Ligand binder design. Structure first.
Ligand SMILES: *[C@@H]1O[C@H](CO)[C@@H](O[C@@H]2O[C@H](CO)[C@@H](O[C@@H]3O[C@H](CO[C@H]4O[C@H](CO[C@H]5O[C@H](CO)[C@@H](O)[C@H](O)[C@@H]5O)[C@@H](O)[C@H](O[C@H]5O[C@H](CO)[C@@H](O)[C@H](O)[C@@H]5O)[C@@H]4O)[C@@H](O)[C@H](O[C@H]4O[C@H](CO)[C@@H](O)[C@H](O)[C@@H]4O)[C@@H]3O)[C@H](O)[C@H]2NC(C)=O)[C@H](O)[C@H]1NC(C)=O
Ligand SMILES: *[C@@H]1O[C@H](CO)[C@@H](O)[C@H](O)[C@H]1NC(C)=O
Ligand SMILES: *[C@@H]1O[C@H](CO)[C@@H](O)[C@H](O)[C@H]1NC(C)=O
Ligand SMILES: *[C@H]1O[C@H](CO)[C@@H](O)[C@H](O)[C@@H]1O
Ligand SMILES: Oc1cccc(O)c1
Ligand SMILES: [Cu+2]
Ligand SMILES: [Cu+2]
Length: 371
């Protein structure tokens, strides 16, 4: 007897999520029992990682931020590292990978190939980590992902008093206004304290309402990563009731992906936008450059988990479900996304791949589950 309606207590909504996760696990292992049970990988909550396991993942990311970039210098003058290769492709394709029929599948392929770079070029042998927003929604500063310790993705940025609010515009919908959080400047501590963003900004929202952008966001612009942790954003968008509501109240792929990213004109930015903007800073508030924030990978692990749960609740109808076009909010208009639509990650990793081969975590190149 699966839940059918999200509960309003955090604690009960948390148990609903575990139960839906358990069901999705059962369905995926059954379809696997070449992806086999023996080589089925498990992705896990960052809280399940030991201190050594956390440090092994962080070290591999740091390795990727030193190894030289494969992107041709003339196509992206500012790229220096393999990590930059992933940021660059995301900047370059942002207009066709968000609010499109490809949004969920493209990002599944994106983070998988990031994982492959960690394993093949940086000797990583651990599990892929995800960030469970619901456990941190009441105090982001205490998240194991963001607490600033040697096992965080670094923490908060240096505090900047009396910051203006954040104003979010999209088309000519009424603006959405957010608090600026408790940071503002360069991250003060953690393993990514000396790490440099090399690309962007491309569309960086600033406290006060301004939006700054480099003339060419692919030219060299080394600078610190900035954060402004904003618990209030997670409290409104990323709580366990909000997570379960997205899963249970969405009956088709259109409503699922739209509620996740935020329905334009609803005043809500969804679990996707909520998780992004709660980091604040740079590139936390830049849609194009967001992979520059090292927590991007854990945030989209959770995005992919929530999609994988939703898929497995009715696999016959939801496994291959696609809706939307090839352009951001279909502006300008483009043909519908289908299973023959091909996507690629540029020079980041991998090669071109059709939507058909991306829809299941245990087919095509994929062989994993979430616990
Ligand atoms: C931002 O995003 C955009 C959009 O994605 C991106 O632009 C892409 O830009 C890259 C480079 O900047 C492009 O990659 C190059 O494409 C060259 C042209 O390739 C096409 O046409 C070839 C010619 O086809 C004709 O001639 C042949 C032979 O005479 C004939 O048989 C055909 O019928 C046709 O008439 C064709 O060969 C090629 O196809 C092969 O490869 C593609 C995958 O690339 C594959 O899908 C095909 O099935 C086929 O196997 C393709 O159709 C190409 O020459 C060039 O090659 C480089 O790499 C190869 C090794 O792979 C080297 O051998 C070669 O010498 C070159 O160094 C390269 O592939 C890409 O096509 C663009 N894509 C789009 C959609 O526009 C930007 O780069 C992004 N910006 C940033 C910063 O990331
Ligand atoms: C998962 O499968 C096990 C074994 O068949 C079963 O005992 C359990 O109740 C299932 N859980 C859910 C949530 O379906
Ligand atoms: C595009 O998809 C919608 C469903 O989302 C469908 O109603 C419409 O007919 C499709 N358009 C074309 C040209 O196939
Ligand atoms: C439990 O806590 C969440 C925040 O984590 C609230 O949104 C919920 O209403 C309940 O108080
Ligand atoms: O795709 C997105 C959406 C919202 C904020 C962000 O940094 C990225
Ligand atoms: Cu993206
Ligand atoms: Cu995202």
């Amino acid at each position: 007897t699966l839940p059918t309606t999200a509960s309003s207590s955090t604690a009960v909504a948390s148990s609903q999520l575990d139960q839906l996760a358990n069901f999705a696990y059962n369905v995926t292992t059954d379809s696997v029992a070449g992806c086999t049970l023996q080589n089925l990988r498990v992705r896990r909550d960052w809280r399940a990682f030991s201190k050594t396991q956390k440090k092994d993942y962080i070290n591999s990311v740091l390795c990727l931020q030193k190894l030289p970039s494969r992107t041709p210098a003339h196509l992206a003058p500012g790229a220096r590292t393999r990590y930059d290769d992933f940021v660059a492709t995301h900047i370059n394709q942002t207009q066709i990978i968000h609010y499109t029929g490809t949004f969920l599948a493209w990002h599944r392929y994106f983070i998988y190939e990031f994982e492959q770079a960690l394993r093949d070029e940086c000797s990583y042998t651990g599990d892929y980590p995800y960030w469970n927003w619901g456990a941190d929604a009441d105090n982001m500063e205490k998240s194991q992902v963001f607490d600033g310790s040697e096992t965080s993705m670094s923490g908060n940025g240096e505090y900047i008093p009396n910051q203006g609010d954040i104003k979010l515009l999209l088309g000519n919908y009424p603006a959405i206004d957010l608090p600026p959080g408790s940071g503002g400047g360069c991250v003060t501590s953690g393993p990514f304290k000396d790490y440099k963003l090399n690309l962007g900004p491309a569309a960086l929202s600033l406290p006060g309402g301004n939006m700054t952008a480099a003339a060419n966001p692919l030219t060299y612009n080394p600078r610190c990563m900035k954060r402004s942790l904003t618990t209030e954003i997670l409290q409104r968008y990323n709580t366990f009731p909000k997570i379960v509501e997205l899963i249970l109240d969405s009956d088709d792929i259109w409503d699922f992906q739209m509620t996740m990213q935020g329905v334009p004109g609803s005043g809500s930015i969804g679990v996707h936008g909520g998780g992004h903007y709660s980091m604040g800073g740079d590139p936390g508030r830049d849609v194009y450059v967001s992979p520059g924030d090292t927590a991007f990978w854990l945030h989209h692990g959770m995005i992919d988990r929530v999609w994988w749960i939703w898929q497995n609740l009715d696999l016959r109808k939801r496994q291959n479900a696609i809706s939307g076009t090839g352009t951001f909010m279909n502006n300008p208009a483009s043909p519908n996304t289908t299973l023959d639509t091909v996507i690629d990650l540029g020079y980041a990793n991998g090669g071109p791949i059709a939507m058909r081969d991306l829809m299941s975590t245990t087919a095509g190149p994929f062989c994993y589950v979430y616990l």
